[PDB]
């Protein structure tokens, strides 16, 4: 006999809501993963990707990727998210140097040619390209930086061709004994063993769920309902709550709003640019008075 | 023993396929000193490299 506290009064969501921006074009998978020419690793090419749908299932006919590793995001979530600014870094390396396109790695490519940051969000994709970048006499059009006085900073590109002083005598701008040109030719042949064969590498870098996003996955948007507890998906950010109209004035570079507990309590709707306030549906404590289970 | 571990001279001629360090990050390898250094060398097939 007494009075006992219980779980607070919770209301379950009624339906699901997906709100993605109005984008119709597909992302240039042919222009990135099926380009006629790829850049050298010392002069790696960075391409900006915007205003498209990341439907990578269309790659399934003609990709055959040997390396696909994502870092800040699980791959199975990639179809349910939106990406704010997307950059594709394309180059060609040896087969043995693909492992150097991971963060926190050492080696000639990771120190002198291409470095990834310690906090890297994105996916590294690499595939064999011996049928494209190799010829019988030897393809020597792909260069790498062999000599440098210091390691590269993350996402830094060095295209200098200054003569490297490998010994003690100064070079005076000319090459000779212990004075070498810093760029060296890859030797690509079809009869080369794997690891000495050309590999095409595309590194996709993006930032998630903090800025307005423009590249989005293949999710069909639904209607926007208000004043009801729903499951929402705003630009890849999922959640549960009631969405109501808001008088918050978002600055044009902002997409989400946070309270003192740093949870998302305001959002800009991507189709109709209106500010919505998110309010959790569960509220209010519940107690139960009994005169005893034995008594009644 | 009694030598400088400057592995950058391996960049000319090595082309390693497997390089995995366990007790130390690779990027710290230029900033450290090593006390009891041993090299165990052998030959296996590829499938046993793992």
């Amino acid at each position: 006999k007494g009075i006992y506290q219980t779980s607070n009064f919770r209301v379950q969501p009624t339906e699901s809501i997906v709100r993605f921006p109005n984008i119709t074009n597909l992302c240039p998978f042919g222009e990135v993963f099926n380009a006629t020419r790829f850049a050298s690793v010392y002069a790696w090419n960075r391409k900006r990707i915007s205003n498209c749908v990341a439907d990578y299932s269309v790659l399934y006919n003609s990709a055959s990727f040997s390396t696909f590793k994502c870092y800040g995001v699980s791959p199975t979530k990639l179809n349910d998210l939106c990406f704010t600014n997307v950059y594709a870094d394309s180059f060609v390396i040896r087969g043995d140097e693909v492992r150097q396109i991971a963060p926190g790695q050492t080696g000639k490519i990771a120190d002198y040619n291409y470095k990834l940051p310690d906090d890297f969000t994105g996916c590294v994709i690499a595939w064999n390209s011996n049928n494209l970048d190799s010829k019988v006499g030897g393809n020597y059009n792909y260069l790498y930086r062999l000599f440098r006085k210091s390691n590269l900073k993350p996402f830094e590109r060095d295209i200098s061709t200054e003569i490297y002083q490998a010994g003690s005598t100064p070079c005076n701008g000319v090459e000779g004994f212990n004075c070498y040109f810093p760029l060296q030719s890859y030797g690509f042949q079809p009869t080369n063993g794997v690891g000495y064969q050309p590999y095409r590498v595309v590194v996709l870098s993006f930032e998630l769920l903090h800025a307005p996003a423009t590249v989005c996955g293949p999710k069909k948007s639904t209607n926007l309902v208000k004043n009801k507890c729903v499951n929402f998906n705003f630009n890849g950010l999922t959640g549960t709550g009631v969405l109501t109209e808001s008088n918050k004035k978002f600055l044009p570079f902002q997409q989400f709003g946070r309270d003192i507990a740093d949870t998302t309590d305001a959002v800009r709707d991507p189709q109709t640019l209106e500010i919505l306030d998110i309010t959790p549906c569960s509220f209010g404590g519940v107690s139960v008075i009994t005169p005893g289970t034995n008594t009644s | 023993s009694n030598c400088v571990a400057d592995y950058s001279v391996l960049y000319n001629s090595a082309s390693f396929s497997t390089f995995k360090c366990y007790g130390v990050s690779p990027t710290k390898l230029n900033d450290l000193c090593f006390t009891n250094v041993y090299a165990d060398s052998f030959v296996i097939r590829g499938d046993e490299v793992r």
């Binding site: 020597y140 260069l143 062999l146 090459e175 070498y180 040109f181 760029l183 060296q184 030719s185 | 000319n12 001629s13």
Partner: peptide, 14 residues
């Protein structure tokens, strides 16, 4: 070859 063996970007040739 773009350069002779030992010169240019062909230093590591032969």
């Amino acid at each position: 070859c773009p350069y002779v063996l030992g010169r240019x970007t062909c230093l590591x040739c032969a």
